Amino acid sequence: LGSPEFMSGSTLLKETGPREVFCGLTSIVWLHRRMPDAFFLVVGSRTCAHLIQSAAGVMIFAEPRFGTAILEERDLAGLADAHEELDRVVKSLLKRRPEIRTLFLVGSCPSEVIKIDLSRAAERLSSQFNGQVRILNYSGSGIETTFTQGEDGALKALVPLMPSSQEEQLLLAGTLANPVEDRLKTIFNRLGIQKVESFPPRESTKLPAIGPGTKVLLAQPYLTDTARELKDRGAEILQAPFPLGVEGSQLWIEAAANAFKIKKTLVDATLEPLITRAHKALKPYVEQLSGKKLFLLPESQLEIPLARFLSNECGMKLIEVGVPYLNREMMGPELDLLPQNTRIVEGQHVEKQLDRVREHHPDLVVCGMGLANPLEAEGISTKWSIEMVFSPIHGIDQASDLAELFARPLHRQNLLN
């Protein structure tokens, strides 16, 4: 921990040391299901291969959806041409899965350290097919990306393939659950916004068009590069907090309505029943969560909006809000909503951070699954952090469900004892 900085009444610290997070390769676990017509081929080692199947291999696959081109000794010794090897591997893969429409060559620590030019390989491979299979590249390496940053890489790679258009369009960027996607679209249509599309899409071949006149709402806080690339193609990136809970979702929706100049009386008549019902639904969880001390370890960059929601709407007390990365301009609107004197730590020293957890003994510690069960054995209740990336947590109507995710382990603690 170094000298503190101060922004929006809140404290920003930075810590260096041992980290316990996922590399960006793990983005495949959710991305392969958002876009089933895509395949994710990692170029790396057996470690990378082992990572993905230790994650997703608990499920049984009739058809493979991901894989690893494992670097061999000859590759490292430069005795085999990397580009010839990639071509041969991609060749025999499309034999086993001839229905692949989009192939992602995902960079790893090994491929990025020795700098295999996967991007050019992707270009050349795309050329050799071009009517059938699109081949793209993004890095999911641990040395470069943390967890959800992998999605930022994947979406950024799709951006150049988005059709060019100057049409009216509200673009929702970031992985949404299917029913959440449909719900937000329905609401947006009630406001008079007829063109609402999602990025990423459900099919890799059907990318939304982009250009000037496209307003972009960022549903996920980890789309730094994707947002920048969307802006480079003419789209306007709306600034707003993230659609978590009533407060965040309301302002997020208002941002788009303001940009489309929708009359305030209409957006109020539309959002009012949703908000009132949400406040009603939230009550039993607030009862469970109010006054509870919360401590979040860095994982996904969801920690700041989650902390904002759990304190403002559920009445939890924040001990420490850890993030693996902090885009201050992007978290701007979110930092303004946070309660005063919030302690935010960018980076991590897991051992020292653990000491801070142990000395405080929080009511609920949001942490990874490398620390969850060990903390439980120490009599410290946890909420495994990964769940929020795999749950329908966005929108006014999902506020109570989001709160339930944190109320659940506390509730279970009571039931069992």
Binding site: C23, S45, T47, H50, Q53, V58, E63, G142, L371
Partner: protein, 488 residues
Amino acid sequence: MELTLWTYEGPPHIGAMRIATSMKGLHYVLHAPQGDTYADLLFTMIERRGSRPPVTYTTFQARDLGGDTAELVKGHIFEAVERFKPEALLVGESCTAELIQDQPGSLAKGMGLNIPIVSLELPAYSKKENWGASETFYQLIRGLLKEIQSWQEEGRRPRVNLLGPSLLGFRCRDDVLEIQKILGENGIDINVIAPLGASPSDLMRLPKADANVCLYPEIAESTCLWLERNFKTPFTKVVPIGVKATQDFLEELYELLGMEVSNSDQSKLPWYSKSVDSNYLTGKRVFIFGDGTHVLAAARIANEELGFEVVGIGTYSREMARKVRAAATELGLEALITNDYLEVEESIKECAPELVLGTQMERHSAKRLGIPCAVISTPMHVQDVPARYSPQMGWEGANVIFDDWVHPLMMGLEEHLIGMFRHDFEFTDGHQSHLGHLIHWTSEGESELAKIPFFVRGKVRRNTEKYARQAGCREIDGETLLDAKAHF
């Protein structure tokens, strides 16, 4: 490069981590990039442990590559020893760290630490998990004991070491329990169980045993060999999985100890398999795959204890290759020695078995091919680390094996009824209700093929086409399918 949809083993450092975590008082400094800490979940989620693995990762980032990554690992070695105060220290690299070559192991030995240091040289691009664990286990013991009949004369019970069991091993938790129980009933004490549960101090007691029991050769064969050369300690080579195998194992250990005289009915498998409801199990076609030890064990059980016909067999353990080939030869088969999932899938598809006895990865191919499957070996996931007592070894292990290997098969009455009547609205073709879920062929030829009762239809189609090629037959018809049947 090697296209790998599923890897049968992890990189070798996982094997090293398995040794350090299975033990106590042994810490592990791993030079690795940020993100390799996923390995912790293998122990906290799959093995469901309530403690962090004794592993300190340097977790370097890209920004660190522009700096002193060697100083980075030195600092973590200091911190780890100071904070955790272990009896001995493992120092090693991950695949990525192996590229930048910081020599972290030799560095550790030059830092003035006053505890034993094992410098691990694991080639992540040439070797795999089990080799990693065996190498780590070997070097640690070689390092601890390098500088350095009777039980009859002392007037004490014979005592053996149990070498091999480990976390992320297959049912090691209960195999140890079962074997320890059986040995005690045979009047044989346990000296040291390692690596699982052992400290470096315990490892010092390894020569004190009258014999070494090598339960998991993939992990402990190199060590038993080293212990034999240096301390004259003999070691068993029969792994006690299966009724007959457990009997042979008992007879073997008795010889090495010099005792005299294990009954068969101590397991319930012999009676269950002898009973009449197992009559229809005779000749059911099974494919077998996994690590060497469990494949060899399963092969004898399927062939000599259950009455299955092994139609395919293989292993990913290349160090076990010659033994699997010998076993395959007895079975009249050619052994599939590979780590290529697509080759395994293909081999299963080609011989079209009624049952697959493989790893977690074989569930993938069995699902696609619609074949009843059961897991007999690592790689595994959380389902195969159950709460209940679930050994594979000894008398009770054979009981578990009987239940689990027969379970995926359609049951007797239902299988007979589907062979009799094919026009049901609920009990259709390929339906198994006990799981609680709702070159050219002529039109004449395929009609006789649909008559074949499901799971054996695959082999029938193969044999008929092989028959039609084997003769001057062109097309195929209903009669040539019946001809093929009488031919084989």
